[PDB]
């Protein structure tokens, strides 16, 4: 059981500052890049920032939405990643998660911050236990290829995220074999071969474009019967 655990969120005024923390355990933290991703009712999942290794001189990249306002950092001696947020805006409101590994296997429980290219997925699909269902993930730029390193992440109730697939078709460890990743008709695709009732969940894809991620809007999968 790898664990990630965010802290530092709260209820803040526009214009303010706050620093989030995330402590990791159960894997060799220093060997992996780390990301912040945030969730709002209004904008789904949004990738915020990444930080690479000590051998990359801890190189960082940011979403355009936070560039010049946020700073990501890490302390490998404390197995921790941080997000310094300056000039908070109402639109920064959301649940903030630290996530990484192949490429979004592990997520923390999130810390809530309240301030007061298009990737397309099916809005909803309906299946039943034992069926085969395929979800898809399209890029506005053109065909999805293995150079987009498609990931699939599952959201179960009260914001429990787990990475299922990374690098197009690599199943994260301990992920059930009924889940598989593919490229089909120039989209990325996630197939559940024999859906189970507990697979009722929201499924997000994320695509990589040279130096940043764009998350799709998510598919609500209902499993009836």
């Amino acid at each position: 059981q790898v664990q990630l655990q965010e802290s530092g969120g709260g209820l803040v005024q526009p214009g303010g500052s706050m620093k989030l923390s995330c402590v990791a355990s159960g894997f060799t933290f220093s060997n992996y890049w780390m990301n912040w991703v945030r969730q709002s009712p209004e904008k789904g999942l949004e990738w915020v920032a990444e930080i690479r290794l000590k051998s990359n001189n801890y190189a960082t990249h940011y979403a355009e939405s936070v560039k010049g306002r946020f700073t990501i950092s890490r302390d490998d001696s404390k197995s921790s990643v941080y997000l310094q947020m300056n000039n908070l805006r109402a639109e920064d409101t959301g649940i903030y998660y630290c996530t990484g590994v192949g490429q979004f296997a592990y997520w923390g429980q999130g810390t809530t911050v309240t301030v007061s290219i298009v990737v397309t997925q099916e809005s909803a699909l309906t299946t039943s236990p034992g069926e085969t269902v395929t979800l898809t993930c399209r890029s506005s730029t053109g065909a999805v290829t293995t150079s987009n390193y498609a990931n699939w992440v599952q959201e179960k109730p009260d914001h429990l995220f787990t990475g299922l697939i990374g690098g197009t078709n690599n199943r994260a460890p301990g992920v059930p074999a009924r889940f598989s990743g593919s490229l089909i008709g120039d989209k990325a695709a996630l197939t559940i071969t024999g859906a189970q009732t507990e697979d009722e969940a929201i499924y997000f894809c994320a695509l990589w474009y040279s130096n940043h991620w764009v998350f799709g809007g998510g598919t609500k999968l209902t499993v009836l019967g």
């Binding site: 590994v101 192949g102 390193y149 040279s210 991620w213």
Partner: peptide, 6 residues
């Protein structure tokens, strides 16, 4: 070219 480490 993201973090492809296993």
């Amino acid at each position: 070219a993201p973090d492809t480490r296993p």
